[PDB]
Amino acid sequence: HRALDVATELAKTFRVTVRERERAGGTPKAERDAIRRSGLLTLLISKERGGLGESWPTVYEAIAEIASADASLGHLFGYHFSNFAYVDLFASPEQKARWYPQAVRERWFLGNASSENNAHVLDWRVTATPLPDGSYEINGTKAFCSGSADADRLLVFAVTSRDPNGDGRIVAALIPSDRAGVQVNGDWDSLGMRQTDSGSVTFSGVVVYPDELLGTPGQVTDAFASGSKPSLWTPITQLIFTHLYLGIARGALEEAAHYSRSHSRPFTLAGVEKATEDPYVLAIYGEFAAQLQVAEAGAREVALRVQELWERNHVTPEQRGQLMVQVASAKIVATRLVIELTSRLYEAMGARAAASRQFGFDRFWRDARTHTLHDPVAYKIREVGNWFLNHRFPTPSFYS
Amino acid sequence: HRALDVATELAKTFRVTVRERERAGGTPKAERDAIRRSGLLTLLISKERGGLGESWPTVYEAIAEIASADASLGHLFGYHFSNFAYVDLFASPEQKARWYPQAVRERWFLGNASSENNAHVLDWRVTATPLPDGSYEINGTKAFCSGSADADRLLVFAVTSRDPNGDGRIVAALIPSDRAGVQVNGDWDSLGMRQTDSGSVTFSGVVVYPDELLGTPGQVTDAFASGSKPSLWTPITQLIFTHLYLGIARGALEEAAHYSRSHSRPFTLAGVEKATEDPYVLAIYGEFAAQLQVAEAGAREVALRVQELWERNHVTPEQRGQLMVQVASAKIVATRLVIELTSRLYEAMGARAAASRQFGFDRFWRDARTHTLHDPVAYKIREVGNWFLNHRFPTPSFYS
Amino acid sequence: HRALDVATELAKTFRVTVRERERAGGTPKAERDAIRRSGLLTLLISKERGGLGESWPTVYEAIAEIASADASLGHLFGYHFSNFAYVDLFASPEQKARWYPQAVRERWFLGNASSENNAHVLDWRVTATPLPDGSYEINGTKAFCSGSADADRLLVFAVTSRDPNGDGRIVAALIPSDRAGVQVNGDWDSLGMRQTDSGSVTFSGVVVYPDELLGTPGQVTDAFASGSKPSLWTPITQLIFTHLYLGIARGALEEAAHYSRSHSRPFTLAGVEKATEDPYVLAIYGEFAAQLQVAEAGAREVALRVQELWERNHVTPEQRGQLMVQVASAKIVATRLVIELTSRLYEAMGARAAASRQFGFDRFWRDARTHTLHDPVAYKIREVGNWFLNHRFPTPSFYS
Amino acid sequence: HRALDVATELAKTFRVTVRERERAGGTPKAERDAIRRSGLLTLLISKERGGLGESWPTVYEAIAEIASADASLGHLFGYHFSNFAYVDLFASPEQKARWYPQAVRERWFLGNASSENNAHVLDWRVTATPLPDGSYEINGTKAFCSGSADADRLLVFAVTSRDPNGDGRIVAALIPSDRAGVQVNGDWDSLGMRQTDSGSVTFSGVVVYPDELLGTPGQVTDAFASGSKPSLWTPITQLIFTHLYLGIARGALEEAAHYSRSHSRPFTLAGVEKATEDPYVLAIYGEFAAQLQVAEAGAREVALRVQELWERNHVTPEQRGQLMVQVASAKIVATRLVIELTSRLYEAMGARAAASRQFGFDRFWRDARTHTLHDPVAYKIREVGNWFLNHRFPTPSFYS
Ligand SMILES: Cc1cc2nc3c(=O)[nH]c(=O)nc-3n(C[C@H](O)[C@H](O)[C@H](O)COP(=O)(O)O)c2cc1C
Ligand SMILES: Cc1cc2nc3c(=O)[nH]c(=O)nc-3n(C[C@H](O)[C@H](O)[C@H](O)COP(=O)(O)O)c2cc1C
Ligand SMILES: Cc1cc2nc3c(=O)[nH]c(=O)nc-3n(C[C@H](O)[C@H](O)[C@H](O)COP(=O)(O)O)c2cc1C
Ligand SMILES: Cc1cc2nc3c(=O)[nH]c(=O)nc-3n(C[C@H](O)[C@H](O)[C@H](O)COP(=O)(O)O)c2cc1C
Ligand SMILES: c1ccc2c(c1)sc1ccccc12
Ligand SMILES: c1ccc2c(c1)sc1ccccc12
Ligand SMILES: c1ccc2c(c1)sc1ccccc12
């Protein structure tokens, strides 16, 4: 229970200052260094390599706990583990032996530069052109690069260009954020998630060496199309997002409840003597706490299944498909829950909870409302419907 | 897995005939006898006493499976385990050493006569008059006596009367359904749950012998008041109801999807070519399938905790209260899900699914609409809200 | 107020017997004759021609009031006016001069035979083949022929075949229901709307004469595509459906309230002394009555606009499209309301309202759930959204 | 039509600057002066007295129009008419003969100081101490004094103290905001409604002269208890709030639609090519636009009834109660609509609508979420339920 106690203490510390920090935006450097000092960035690194030797259920619980205190830090922490998962699923034994002890000693906090701001999510224009001796050169701009500021290593994706062994192949690499030609742009000014540093990143002639490549170019496409073990990356990552939404939900419900207990006035016009005994206040808390209990219990079960399949040598298409359906279902339910709860709970607190902007309760809705648009919930709903009605598992990809 | 395989095969046979049987109402004797021959009524009896020595997770899964095929049979089966749970929590070791091998040998299917139709659910008027030899005489009429027809034993509740040691004290007993003076009235004629035989039972001078009594007078009240282990009866039973709702929900979704694949016509007016590719059909299946996956996953966690506390020698009010809150939340979510989907799934099927009465899909809504009224979900919502906001566990009762 | 008083009195009488009549299904001949005697079938015929010279707001109010007592009689009554509206929009001056006094004298109650059960709703295969002197012969089977039993005249639609003047043109005619070769099949057996007689009708060599044709073959296609005055038929008819749903909603709300005042028990476990003072019972009635008040007030405005445009010589595409959008909006809101309310009101009444099948409250949900599937509400929603987002009015058709 | 054209033009100009102005908060002096110059503040003053002699339907439509551009200015404009309505309902004919020509000539924009921040609403501590001449000395601080800054007159409420003719009676008056001892505090820093100046006002020995008093002490209480014409103030004012919510809803829908047409990217992962043709985007717009059409149509009818009763010399409790129920119903529907729509419309726009804080669409949710808490919608729901189920009209008060 030690790692979770560490995460709980981190979250308590983050609650004290999140109101003022999130207003200013920018990089939460002091808090990222506290996470570095905590050791939790090493949860999934084996003890033999210097890490904590912990499991995915612990990682998910820590993500939700931190997210309940500070959604931007929960996002950054969770995305670190999405990046780590990708690295771990493709790294060679040589790379793990070098990188993981280094990640412990240098306290790596991983960032990524993957998505782009073109015509659609599939229009990728960051290229990797081959160099002598097996290196590549990266050129172009990436968007929504969560945790790219103050990241020690960047997980980067590019498409092979002018490549004699095949253009259009997806290359992934793990490079130092201070490699020449890498420019983090710090242009993140959002409604919520205001400290995630999810702005754009530009690559000018950036060299990637062979010992930084995560598999051969195109290997990710083969692993996903085949259902190899790396196809677990998408359910793992979407369950990370699910735990952000559940953490935000619980944080909002608990903060509202503290307000109601200490500050809400009874509607004596209707004969109520105490706001905490009002039947409609109690009904609001009961409706949302009930949905949260069921969603949290369901999320714990799916997290245990993530761990189970993580440990297998091979995951069948049925096992991976079933997991992806369970994860998508959890994310759908958590998305609806957090969006509704963070808005409707004002009705349990009363007008003064909005009349003083500084109370800051709208941070929960602003964070949830921003992040949940990460990928459209309508098409997660369509994928679950296509599975149930047509017996079609989602196609493994970066989004399903 | 053997036990769940047997339940799955039972459910398959019940699906073949449920549409015809439930119209008639009345007692599903052949199907009750099939359940008797299956051995599953002995799921929770230890192997040492001739039973299967299985766990509550298996019982709850079996309940949902059967209920997905025939909600009345799922109800009869589930209430048998509610009755069994009461006996197990209150009978002496000496009584259980006699009753349980007899229940196995005689293939006992339990019913109950407990609630009444007076001014409100607390108002009980069926009396137990003490006789000099330690026996009691029972007089009065009970309502909603599920499984009272064809029952090998009835779990019966009465309040003491003409009692020098105190009137109004609740006594419970397990008695043969054909004991002199017991009249099963056969007046069950309901919207849904049409074969549960939940009619009235009239007791005329019915003798109860000392070795048929479950505890002492008022003992159930004392156990409720102290939140001790016998008060687990309520979360156990409320979780039985939850699994009826999850089972009905799954059955309705599967039956609707079969119609959507086989008979629904594409809305060509809007350019649709296949109903199974219609975006709004797919969204209905996705939304409800997603909520069902999360609810079923959370329900499995709560069932594991039921088993945990069932095996304990002592249970504290905090353990019992936390379990009751988790059960209540599961019941709330399942109630809303089943009531919504059994009505809205018609929109995924089309007009002819209702215009052809013989299709009989309305059975799912009728069954769920009837059963979910067992006790008011508004007060399960209040109970979860009072816990979350005011840190007050539900007051243990026959309902909470 | 005379006409509305007559409809109110009719509805009063229908309420006495609807519970018994709709169980049996079949043709409500006695009630149809009571409507004939009332004169209300002539509401839209000018006094000059022997009718009442009333307005569409009166028709719509009468439809909703009758539907609140008996949805099948409300449906038959309303569809009579959809049939009359089609006739009035396409009939020649000499057809009106002959038919309308005859409809008054003979107390005509109209039915129709229009839709079919082929691959999709566009797919019409009942043929009209030329005969000498401009007559046509009709062959094939129609489905969903509301009011086709006991009909004085049938509005029938067919597609021309082996026609020198052009194949595949839609022809419409108003013919006697007992003409040789017309076989009303009497096969309506529905979940709800059980006395609308909406079964199939088979046409074997049925002769239609030129003086029974409603415009030339294909004229309806041209009138809808061009937005000439007959394009009002669809918003008129969809608003008829809307008033069926509002009528059912009001009838259900009022019937539930009577049960709650008379029979519901207080939940004394939570300290409630009277069910009519329960905060959650009150919230259910308040939610649904509030939405009903708004929906009804909105529907009055749209019905007035129907009358205003009905009196216009020419209606622009803006005026027709805005009306169709207002009608579709009213129908969407009414559909959601009646489907939710007819199911959720059980929670304000209690278990015994469902456990005693004879109470028959489920008739409201059965009727509403059946009729609201007439055409898919998802595509009414799309039509309103296409208008608001893209400024595209719905393409006029039999559906929009 | 001229007045509404003027309001539409005002709203056009407000939309240009609202994003920048509402961020700063404070007093929108230039825009208040634009409203002064428009003459619309005199809409309800008779032409005889120099006003526009217009109707409440015109006022309500102008309130919604302005609120759709700038919710704070719509609120200020709307509350001006609430203040005016109170004056008209309680002022003597002689008072109006002086005040209304002055309000025209001096372009009065009214504010109020009425509510307070004590243990519960209606727990009032601002006192009125009688002076020998019939004046009152006012002492205390008022809360939520909308429009208190830059107000030409304040409508003020106090409770009598040290009063031989009875303590605790409510007095009301209309006084200059620069009367000696009046301090408008400017302490308003809110989530939304950021330019309504709803801070506190402190009265230090403020003398109120006899010709400024509105009625006699406790007359407002007696009017409420009688349900007589002056108690129309509450339904009038609650319908003002309703039109704020309908205006915010319409403004949010149109602003979102503009973004969707201009900036939303199609989700090619699913094969869609234009965001404005996405089936789920279209469903969101259609669902909310449909609900909005019906709500707006219904609100127009209730506004016509406000005008009817406003022109009567006497109003019965039944007429007032029926109107209050209709107003409560409109408020309930509008509240639910605006709160859902201002949050869910992000799903129709996509992530970049929230990633760019400066888009500023969250203003609609912040404004609606703040104002809808004015009084709890849960008790409007109970009030409508108590009327429908128990035939009890709402108890007249400042809130019902
Ligand atoms: C708060 C937030 C954080 C995001 N973080 C990442 C990220 O770390 N890596 C990535 O590839 N995309 C990230 N995305 C991008 C989304 O996956 C997606 O590309 C984007 O939301 C599409 O925007 P649209 O809906 O306007 O088309 C993020 C998006 C949001 C809103
Ligand atoms: C934006 C806003 C403006 C308000 N303006 C006024 C006002 O002008 N006059 C008034 O008496 N109350 C005003 N109120 C207050 C309500 O009457 C009520 O006192 C308050 O909303 C209750 O606060 P609570 O729910 O936190 O207990 C306003 C409230 C809000 C939220
Ligand atoms: C109760 C009911 C009555 C109907 N009455 C008629 C009718 O009178 N004339 C007609 O053309 N269609 C009628 N329809 C049919 C619709 O036009 C449409 O063909 C049908 O609902 C589509 O069926 P589907 O959703 O199963 O494909 C009726 C449908 C229902 C449910
Ligand atoms: C389908 C159904 C089955 C029921 N079976 C039982 C039962 O077996 N034993 C029992 O004590 N109560 C049973 N109940 C009754 C509830 O405990 C409760 O008394 C009843 O639902 C309250 O009815 P009311 O809401 O109309 O007041 C049953 C209720 C329903 C609806
Ligand atoms: C109140 C009292 C006893 C019981 C209920 C409600 S449901 C049920 C099911 C089985 C056995 C007893 C009881
Ligand atoms: C397609 C074509 C004709 C008709 C429908 C659908 S519903 C209806 C109701 C009355 C008369 C004609 C029609
Ligand atoms: C309680 C008492 C007075 C008032 C409210 C609530 S809102 C409002 C708006 C304008 C004028 C007076 C009041």
PDB file of C-alpha atoms in Angstrom, chain A residues 253-254 257 260-261 276-277 281-283 285-287 289-291 293-295 297-298 300-301 326 329-330 332-333 336 381-382 384-392, chain B residues 253-254 257 260-261 276-277 281-283 285-287 289-291 293-295 297-298 300-301 326 329-330 332-333 336 381-382 384-392:
ATOM      1  CA  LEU A 253     -18.266  15.154  -5.709  1.00  0.00           C
ATOM      2  CA  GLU A 254     -16.117  15.331  -2.566  1.00  0.00           C
ATOM      3  CA  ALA A 257     -20.018  17.685  -0.388  1.00  0.00           C
ATOM      4  CA  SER A 260     -22.757  21.520   1.238  1.00  0.00           C
ATOM      5  CA  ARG A 261     -21.864  20.375   4.761  1.00  0.00           C
ATOM      6  CA  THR A 276     -27.780  18.327   4.443  1.00  0.00           C
ATOM      7  CA  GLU A 277     -31.281  16.951   5.177  1.00  0.00           C
ATOM      8  CA  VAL A 281     -29.833  17.730  -2.195  1.00  0.00           C
ATOM      9  CA  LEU A 282     -29.611  14.158  -0.915  1.00  0.00           C
ATOM     10  CA  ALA A 283     -31.026  12.862  -4.209  1.00  0.00           C
ATOM     11  CA  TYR A 285     -25.537  13.304  -4.191  1.00  0.00           C
ATOM     12  CA  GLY A 286     -27.122   9.861  -4.189  1.00  0.00           C
ATOM     13  CA  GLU A 287     -27.647   9.689  -7.947  1.00  0.00           C
ATOM     14  CA  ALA A 289     -22.348   8.871  -5.919  1.00  0.00           C
ATOM     15  CA  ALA A 290     -24.165   5.688  -6.996  1.00  0.00           C
ATOM     16  CA  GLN A 291     -23.033   5.970 -10.619  1.00  0.00           C
ATOM     17  CA  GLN A 293     -19.433   3.640  -7.119  1.00  0.00           C
ATOM     18  CA  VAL A 294     -20.515   1.335  -9.936  1.00  0.00           C
ATOM     19  CA  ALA A 295     -18.121   2.898 -12.435  1.00  0.00           C
ATOM     20  CA  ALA A 297     -15.862  -0.917  -9.176  1.00  0.00           C
ATOM     21  CA  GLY A 298     -16.125  -1.749 -12.857  1.00  0.00           C
ATOM     22  CA  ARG A 300     -11.017  -1.856 -10.905  1.00  0.00           C
ATOM     23  CA  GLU A 301     -12.092  -5.125 -12.567  1.00  0.00           C
ATOM     24  CA  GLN A 326     -14.749  -3.274 -21.753  1.00  0.00           C
ATOM     25  CA  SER A 329     -17.557   0.941 -22.235  1.00  0.00           C
ATOM     26  CA  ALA A 330     -15.879   2.229 -19.076  1.00  0.00           C
ATOM     27  CA  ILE A 332     -18.181   6.072 -22.289  1.00  0.00           C
ATOM     28  CA  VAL A 333     -19.817   5.756 -18.870  1.00  0.00           C
ATOM     29  CA  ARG A 336     -21.094  10.958 -19.402  1.00  0.00           C
ATOM     30  CA  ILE A 381     -20.400   4.424 -28.629  1.00  0.00           C
ATOM     31  CA  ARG A 382     -20.581   3.365 -32.279  1.00  0.00           C
ATOM     32  CA  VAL A 384     -19.463  -0.781 -28.818  1.00  0.00           C
ATOM     33  CA  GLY A 385     -22.684  -0.894 -30.821  1.00  0.00           C
ATOM     34  CA  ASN A 386     -20.903  -2.420 -33.815  1.00  0.00           C
ATOM     35  CA  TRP A 387     -19.444  -5.067 -31.489  1.00  0.00           C
ATOM     36  CA  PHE A 388     -22.724  -5.928 -29.791  1.00  0.00           C
ATOM     37  CA  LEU A 389     -24.991  -5.858 -32.834  1.00  0.00           C
ATOM     38  CA  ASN A 390     -22.631  -7.032 -35.570  1.00  0.00           C
ATOM     39  CA  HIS A 391     -20.149  -9.129 -33.528  1.00  0.00           C
ATOM     40  CA  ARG A 392     -17.235  -7.017 -34.794  1.00  0.00           C
TER      41      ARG A 392
ATOM     42  CA  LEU B 253     -30.512  -6.391 -25.670  1.00  0.00           C
ATOM     43  CA  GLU B 254     -29.775  -9.789 -27.216  1.00  0.00           C
ATOM     44  CA  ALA B 257     -30.237  -7.332 -31.731  1.00  0.00           C
ATOM     45  CA  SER B 260     -32.422  -5.745 -35.825  1.00  0.00           C
ATOM     46  CA  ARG B 261     -30.190  -8.161 -37.746  1.00  0.00           C
ATOM     47  CA  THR B 276     -27.300  -2.787 -38.989  1.00  0.00           C
ATOM     48  CA  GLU B 277     -25.220   0.109 -40.370  1.00  0.00           C
ATOM     49  CA  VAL B 281     -29.437   2.067 -34.396  1.00  0.00           C
ATOM     50  CA  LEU B 282     -25.744   1.539 -33.643  1.00  0.00           C
ATOM     51  CA  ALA B 283     -25.768   4.337 -31.049  1.00  0.00           C
ATOM     52  CA  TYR B 285     -26.965  -0.588 -28.932  1.00  0.00           C
ATOM     53  CA  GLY B 286     -23.654   1.057 -28.033  1.00  0.00           C
ATOM     54  CA  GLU B 287     -25.031   3.288 -25.263  1.00  0.00           C
ATOM     55  CA  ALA B 289     -24.287  -2.219 -24.147  1.00  0.00           C
ATOM     56  CA  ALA B 290     -21.659   0.124 -22.650  1.00  0.00           C
ATOM     57  CA  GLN B 291     -23.676   0.822 -19.499  1.00  0.00           C
ATOM     58  CA  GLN B 293     -20.700  -3.834 -19.390  1.00  0.00           C
ATOM     59  CA  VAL B 294     -19.777  -1.406 -16.605  1.00  0.00           C
ATOM     60  CA  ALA B 295     -22.701  -2.431 -14.399  1.00  0.00           C
ATOM     61  CA  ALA B 297     -18.263  -5.582 -14.020  1.00  0.00           C
ATOM     62  CA  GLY B 298     -19.065  -3.588 -10.892  1.00  0.00           C
ATOM     63  CA  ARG B 300     -18.985  -8.892  -9.875  1.00  0.00           C
ATOM     64  CA  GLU B 301     -16.833  -6.943  -7.409  1.00  0.00           C
ATOM     65  CA  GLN B 326     -22.307  -0.659  -2.774  1.00  0.00           C
ATOM     66  CA  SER B 329     -25.566   1.814  -5.930  1.00  0.00           C
ATOM     67  CA  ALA B 330     -25.539  -1.267  -8.151  1.00  0.00           C
ATOM     68  CA  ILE B 332     -29.879   2.077  -8.681  1.00  0.00           C
ATOM     69  CA  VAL B 333     -27.750   1.877 -11.821  1.00  0.00           C
ATOM     70  CA  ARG B 336     -32.342   2.906 -14.478  1.00  0.00           C
ATOM     71  CA  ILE B 381     -30.864   7.010  -3.973  1.00  0.00           C
ATOM     72  CA  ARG B 382     -31.517   8.900  -0.710  1.00  0.00           C
ATOM     73  CA  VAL B 384     -26.566   6.497  -0.939  1.00  0.00           C
ATOM     74  CA  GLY B 385     -26.780  10.291  -0.734  1.00  0.00           C
ATOM     75  CA  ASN B 386     -27.114  10.284   3.062  1.00  0.00           C
ATOM     76  CA  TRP B 387     -24.019   8.089   3.221  1.00  0.00           C
ATOM     77  CA  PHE B 388     -21.956  10.174   0.835  1.00  0.00           C
ATOM     78  CA  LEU B 389     -22.945  13.581   2.208  1.00  0.00           C
ATOM     79  CA  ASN B 390     -23.531  12.869   5.899  1.00  0.00           C
ATOM     80  CA  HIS B 391     -21.416   9.714   6.446  1.00  0.00           C
ATOM     81  CA  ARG B 392     -24.532   7.875   7.650  1.00  0.00           C
TER      82      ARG B 392
END
